[PDB]
């Protein structure tokens, strides 16, 4: 994989109700792993590494 | 002590070698088959402490186990062919062989 | 014999990780003995006791303790219980499935 930005979904399998999350990530070459990820509640969320 | 590559080996027939020159290495050309010695190596063993009734036999026919073992290279099961080539490396500060 | 120190052709050797694990635990035990006859400060001796508990605990098994304390090999040292359990271990592999 190349350092860049990626929009994953991971259809199903999270919350086991059919919810299709959306967990966007920004993998740089040298630094932190910025990850925007949803919850079932449709409230965006952020993690650092 | 060091190991030797001689041809005079424990219990090797005169024709059982048949393919080793003075250095104990096969001739380029001699077809080889199962069990023929490519290189006759022998490693010493010091006072094996042989069995009784074999001390008896070796005393009966006057024969006695030598100092060197039979760690001699040989052609494996089945694989039969020709000896097309030989290389002889040697440690730099050491005597070289006749075939070398 | 079950933890041999076989000789490898070419001057090298081969041992099992049980050997060096035993060696490290014996080293920590000797050190704590030396400490006890010195009556050194209880901080250093308590660290020694902690370290020996660590050593024996990683000897009998590698998983419950936090870090499988590896060696110069960049692989974890393979302790006692790992020679009984698992696929590779005596039971599952060598004690029924044998040549």
């Amino acid at each position: 994989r190349s350092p860049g930005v990626f929009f994953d979904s991971d259809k199903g399998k999270t919350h086991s109700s059919g919810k299709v999350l959306y967990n966007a990530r920004i993998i740089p070459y040298r630094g932190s792993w910025l990850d925007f990820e949803f919850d079932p509640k449709d409230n965006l969320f952020v993690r650092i590494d | 002590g060091p190991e030797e590559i001689t041809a005079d080996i424990p219990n090797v027939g005169e024709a059982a070698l048949s393919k080793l020159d003075e250095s104990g290495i096969v001739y380029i050309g001699a077809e080889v088959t199962g069990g023929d010695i490519l290189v006759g190596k022998v490693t010493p063993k010091g006072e094996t402490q042989l069995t009784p009734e074999e001390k008896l036999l070796r005393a009966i026919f006057g024969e006695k186990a030598s100092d060197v073992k039979d760690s001699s290279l040989r052609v494996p099961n089945g694989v039969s062919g020709t000896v097309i080539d030989v290389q002889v490396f040697t440690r730099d500060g050491v005597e070289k062989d006749k075939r070398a | 014999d079950l933890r041999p120190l076989v000789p490898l052709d070419g001057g090298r050797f081969a041992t099992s990780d049980l050997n060096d694990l035993y060696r490290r635990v014996i080293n920590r035990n000797n050190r704590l003995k030396r400490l006890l006859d010195l009556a050194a400060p209880d901080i250093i001796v308590r660290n020694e006791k902690r370290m020996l508990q660590e050593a024996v605990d990683a000897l009998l098994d590698n998983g419950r303790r936090g870090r499988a304390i590896t060696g110069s090999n960049k692989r974890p040292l393979k302790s006692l219980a790992d020679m009984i359990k698992g696929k590779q271990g005596r039971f599952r592999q060598n004690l029924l499935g044998k040549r």
């Binding site: - | - | 003995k33 006791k49 902690r50 605990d57 009998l60 419950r64």
Partner: protein, 49 residues
């Protein structure tokens, strides 16, 4: 066939009765395993007499 033994300079705790899942020494003495952990690694005393 032979075996050797070792006389430890001091006592030390077997891992299998210590950190196994049901904690064989855990429920042998009414304690939480983290309590005996704090005891073992020289952290806080445990009263006797």
């Amino acid at each position: 066939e032979r075996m050797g033994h070792i006389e430890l300079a001091s006592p030390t705790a077997h891992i299998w009765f210590l950190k196994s899942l049901p904690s064989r020494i855990g429920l042998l003495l009414d304690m939480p395993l983290r309590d005996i952990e704090r005891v073992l690694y020289f952290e806080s005393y445990v009263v006797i007499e």
